[PDB]
Amino acid sequence: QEIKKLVDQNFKPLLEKYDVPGMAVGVIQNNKKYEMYYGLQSVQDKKAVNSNTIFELGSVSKLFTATAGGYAKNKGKISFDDTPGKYWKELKNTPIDQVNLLQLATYTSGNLALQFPDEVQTDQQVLTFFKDWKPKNPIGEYRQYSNPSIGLFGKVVALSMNKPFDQVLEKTIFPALGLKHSYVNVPKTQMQNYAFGYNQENQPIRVNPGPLDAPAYGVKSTLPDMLSFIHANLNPQKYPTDIQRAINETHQGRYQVNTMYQALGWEEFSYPATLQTLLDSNSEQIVMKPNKVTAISKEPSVKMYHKTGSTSGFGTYVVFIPKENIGLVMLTNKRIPNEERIKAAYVVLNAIK
Ligand SMILES: *[B]([O])([O])[C]([C]C1=[C][C]=[C]C(C([O])=O)=[C]1)[N]C(=O)[C]C1=[C][C]=[C]S1
């Protein structure tokens, strides 16, 4: 194959350009996996990145939250027209027991920001924050990307299965996806495999506990595991029917913001997509500001899906195209610009032609 050469030409230069210590790039094509490893999981230890290296997925964790929601919608445990009060008994008749589970999951409450305020930390300050919530935009009309929005979806999904969110992933979702080294909490036996992240001053760091962190950005995984996740997204037919259902649920577009369709967790596009369309989904306009949605008008015949993710120390990108039977995963232990991630992947996936 030329896959190794294409990844070297497009991903490898980025390590020197952004002083990234380590990178794992995976490609899956026609059911065959390719794994490319570069550099170091730990600078101080001179430990090489390899197939056992655990990275922070950041906002790619939202795809797991969405899958978890899809699984609970299919076991009859929740409905996407329901509201959080039906599960968080404590939150009835507040202006937020008026937002649906789908609207939380898809960022359209109309007044929820990217982050909680710093003072919000304990379970008791989170329970308190949602009661005081009040609308601003007409519900359902405006997309603002948001950790609290999908985090609340996550806790509500977990209440429905009667389990804390971490056990829903580690006991139900991850095993159903055949993932063997994916974690919300990395155990002791695996700590030697958890990479250091590196901040913009090249100091070693890992993610800080934060409010509703697990459902919004708290999953850690390996390249083989993410390639399996992509495999399952490219082929849900082979998987247990419960998880198959869950997966198809995350692929359904719910609304448009120009050329971007919002699905559950995933961002969806018409394929082939221009580079600029993919970059727009990660523009300041799209990620950081409110944008008014529209109903899907053009239902694309052939679709592709992506998502970026970051913690302070780590970068992640995942993209797949069902009807070329291909996909790519990039994991780094230092952030690089979202646009760089999206472009390299673009060149590589087009060249496997
Ligand atoms: B998630 O990765 O989308 C989410 C929000 C975020 C943080 C940094 C950069 C982007 C981006 O450009 O798309 C998005 N991540 C987190 O909340 C964890 C953090 C990462 C950095 C500071 S907190």
Side-chain angles (χ1 to χ4, degrees), residues 3-4 6-31 33-46 48-88 90 93-123 125-161 163-187 189-241 243-244 246-251 253-283 285-352:
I3 287 113
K4 187 247 179 206
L6 290 178
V7 171
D8 281 344
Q9 294 170 327
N10 293 283
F11 282 86
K12 196 190 173 176
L14 297 171
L15 293 181
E16 274 180 8
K17 189 178 180 188
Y18 300 96
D19 187 26
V20 182
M23 188 181 289
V25 177
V27 173
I28 183 179
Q29 175 190 34
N30 297 329
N31 302 295
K33 287 166 195 173
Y34 302 80
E35 308 171 15
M36 263 71 46
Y37 299 108
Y38 302 97
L40 298 173
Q41 80 177 51
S42 171
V43 172
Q44 67 190 256
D45 302 307
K46 304 212 152 82
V49 179
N50 65 89
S51 72
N52 303 311
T53 301
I54 293 159
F55 295 81
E56 303 181 350
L57 307 183
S59 296
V60 171
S61 309
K62 297 170 169 91
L63 309 176
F64 293 102
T65 302
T67 300
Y71 182 97
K73 171 167 170 301
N74 289 285
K75 293 263 173 287
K77 306 282 204 199
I78 58 163
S79 153
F80 291 171
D81 294 80
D82 292 354
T83 58
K86 181 165 164 158
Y87 313 101
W88 215 349
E90 281 96 2
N93 291 280
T94 224
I96 208 60
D97 198 38
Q98 291 274 122
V99 172
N100 58 56
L101 303 196
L102 184 63
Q103 284 170 337
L104 289 177
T106 62
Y107 317 118
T108 71
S109 80
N111 196 60
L112 274 182
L114 188 59
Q115 305 292 358
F116 286 100
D118 292 324
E119 187 188 74
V120 185
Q121 287 296 314
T122 55
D123 282 21
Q125 286 135 28
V126 166
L127 181 46
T128 296
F129 172 87
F130 278 122
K131 293 172 150 166
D132 296 14
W133 187 83
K134 257 62 152 158
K136 176 189 292 145
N137 306 8
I139 300 188
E141 281 179 36
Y142 282 81
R143 192 193 175 260
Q144 186 142 216
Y145 187 66
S146 162
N147 289 331
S149 188
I150 197 162
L152 178 58
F153 176 82
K155 178 155 177 54
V156 172
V157 172
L159 288 171
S160 83
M161 295 170 69
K163 313 300 282 164
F165 187 82
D166 63 292
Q167 303 300 288
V168 174
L169 299 190
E170 298 182 353
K171 305 297 177 158
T172 306
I173 307 313
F174 294 163
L177 292 161
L179 305 189
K180 49 213 184 170
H181 294 99
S182 294
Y183 305 100
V184 172
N185 300 297
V186 176
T189 43
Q190 285 295 320
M191 273 303 297
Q192 99 265 35
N193 289 323
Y194 191 168
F196 288 111
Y198 291 86
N199 53 19
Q200 287 324 298
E201 300 101 318
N202 273 79
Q203 290 145 343
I205 45 161
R206 292 190 183 99
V207 67
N208 285 325
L212 289 175
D213 55 0
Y217 58 81
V219 174
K220 297 90 204 196
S221 200
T222 65
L223 186 76
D225 273 12
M226 295 300 295
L227 279 165
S228 298
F229 185 57
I230 298 316
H231 185 260
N233 277 268
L234 291 169
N235 303 299
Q237 66 276 6
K238 298 154 184 164
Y239 285 72
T241 320
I243 202 78
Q244 180 202 223
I247 295 164
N248 295 121
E249 203 71 57
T250 72
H251 297 185
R254 308 291 176 157
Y255 63 74
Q256 286 192 240
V257 181
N258 201 21
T259 59
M260 180 179 87
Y261 301 71
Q262 187 69 58
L264 220 63
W266 302 97
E267 295 163 13
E268 179 196 315
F269 311 85
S270 174
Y271 182 83
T274 71
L275 178 60
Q276 193 62 48
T277 299
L278 300 173
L279 300 173
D280 278 353
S281 67
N282 280 237
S283 66
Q285 197 40 76
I286 299 303
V287 180
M288 288 310 171
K289 318 193 193 281
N291 290 256
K292 195 174 214 301
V293 316
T294 52
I296 293 179
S297 168
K298 297 187 286 188
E299 192 65 80
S301 164
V302 185
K303 281 110 140 184
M304 70 175 287
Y305 304 80
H306 87 190
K307 185 71 182 85
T308 51
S310 295
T311 59
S312 298
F314 290 81
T316 306
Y317 182 63
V318 181
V319 52
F320 72 96
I321 315 158
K323 299 185 187 152
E324 302 298 320
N325 201 212
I326 64 185
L328 176 152
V329 183
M330 182 215 82
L331 306 171
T332 59
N333 67 352
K334 185 177 189 191
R335 301 168 62 175
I336 70 178
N338 282 327
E339 57 269 31
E340 293 274 33
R341 298 177 209 189
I342 291 157
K343 175 168 26 164
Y346 185 92
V347 178
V348 169
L349 296 178
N350 300 338
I352 72 194

